[PDB]
Amino acid sequence: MNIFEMLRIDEGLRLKIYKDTEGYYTIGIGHLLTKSPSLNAAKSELDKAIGRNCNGVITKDEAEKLFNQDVDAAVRGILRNAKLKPVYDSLDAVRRCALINMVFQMGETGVAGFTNSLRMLQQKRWDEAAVNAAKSRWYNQTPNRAKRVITTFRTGTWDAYK
Ligand SMILES: [Cl-]
Ligand SMILES: [Cl-]
Ligand SMILES: [Kr]
Ligand SMILES: [Kr]
Numbered sequence: 001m002n003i004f005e006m007l008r009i010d011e012g013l014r015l016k017i018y019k020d021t022e023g024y025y026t027i028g029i030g031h032l033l034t035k036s037p038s039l040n041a042a043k044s045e046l047d048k049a050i051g052r053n054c055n056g057v058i059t060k061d062e063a064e065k066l067f068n069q070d071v072d073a074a075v076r077g078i079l080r081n082a083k084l085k086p087v088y089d090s091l092d093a094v095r096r097c098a099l100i101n102m103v104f105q106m107g108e109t110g111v112a113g114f115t116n117s118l119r120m121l122q123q124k125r126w127d128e129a130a131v132n133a134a135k136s137r138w139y140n141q142t143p144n145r146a147k148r149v150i151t152t153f154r155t156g157t158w159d160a161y162k
Contacts, residue, residue, distance in 0.1 A: 001158040003071060003097045007104055009161060010145050013063060017042055017056045021142055027056075028063035030104065031070060074100050075107045084112055087122050090102040095121070099150040105145075106138060121153060 017039070020026045025033045025042035033045045039056075046054050050062055057062075058066075071073030078084045078099065088099055102111050112118075114136070120129035130150045133139065139146040151160035 001161060002102055004067070006097055006158075006161055007067075007071065007101060010105075010148065012061070012099065015058055015060065015063065017046065027066075029056060029067040029070075031066045059127070070104065070127065071100070074104045074154075078103055081112060083115075083118065084108060087118050090122055091117050092156055094156050095153055098149050101149050102138075105142075110138075121129075126154045126156075 008029060011063055013029055014027060017027050017033070020030075020032065023037075023104070024035050025039065027046060029144070033042045033049070036042070041056070042045060043056055046056065048057060049066065049104070078088050084099070088096055089126075091099065099111070114133055117129045117133040122131060130153060133150055133153070135147065137145075139150075148160040152159070
């Protein structure tokens with residue numbers, strides 16, 4: 001297991017525009033297109049991202065392409081974020097993947113708001129961080145995913161994904 005496989009599991013793969021868990025237009029592997037409720041808007045943004053007139057449909061390769069870009073940007077965002085970077089650097093390999101997953105999902109801003117959990121992760125207080133992070137909207141809205149991520153932070157293993 002790796003970051004790609006882990007996120008391909010939590011996000012799925014869809015070749016046509018779809019609405020995510022929050023009702024926003026997305027495509028591929030969790031590639032958010034827009035928060036606007038206009039499908040035309042979504043289609044515009046998709047053609048812009050792909051570079052061709054997609055007409056709301058892409059290929060698997062194109063989807064994997066977006067995903068590579070998105071993972072990369074997520075890591076890069078972490079590294080540039082003053083509150084995130086030090087946590088990330090203190091972690092082991094598996095746990096870093098759990099942090100990339102949350103950032104991918106909710107944006108660095110959203111993740112940088114889990115102040116308390118981040119601190120506990122930094123101190124290597126696994127159970128405590130896991131209990132604190134579950135007290136969140138994130139966990140109450142996407143509980144199966146949130147649990148897999150939290151178990152990962154908690155144990156440092158891929159058991160939740162096996
Ligand atoms: Cl809560
Ligand atoms: Cl879920
Ligand atoms: Kr966190
Ligand atoms: Kr956590």
